[PDB]
Amino acid sequence: KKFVARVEEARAEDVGKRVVIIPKGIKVGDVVEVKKV
Amino acid sequence: KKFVARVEEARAEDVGKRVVIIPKGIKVGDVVEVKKV
């Protein structure tokens, strides 16, 4: 269960969605691979 | 450049943060591995 996506900035319409908060070192625009463990 | 974290619900204080929006299939509470590609 894995996917690829780009980090993005949270906006008012994102409130209520499921997210992983991204830390410093990884910026908006970066591509990340997310895999459920 | 990788980390492990739990999916969480976006709230009003998360507006402005960097996030990956998580799709259906992965829920709040799930542990995921995030790796910059």
Residue numbers in the entry:
A (entry chain A), B (entry chain A): 6 to 42
Provide excerpts from the study.
Here, we study fold transition between distinct β-barrels by protein engineering and structural biology technique. Here, we discover that the previously reconstructed ancient DPBB sequence could also adopt a β-barrel fold named Double-Zeta β-barrel (DZBB), as a metamorphic protein. The DZBB fold is not found in any modern protein, although its structure shares similarities with RIFT and OB. Furthermore, the reconstructed OB fold could also be converted to the four-stranded SH3 fold by a simple circular permutation. Thus, these ancient β-barrel folds (DPBB, RIFT, OB, and SH3) could be readily interconverted by a few feasible mutations through the missing-link fold, DZBB, indicating their significantly close evolutionary relationships.
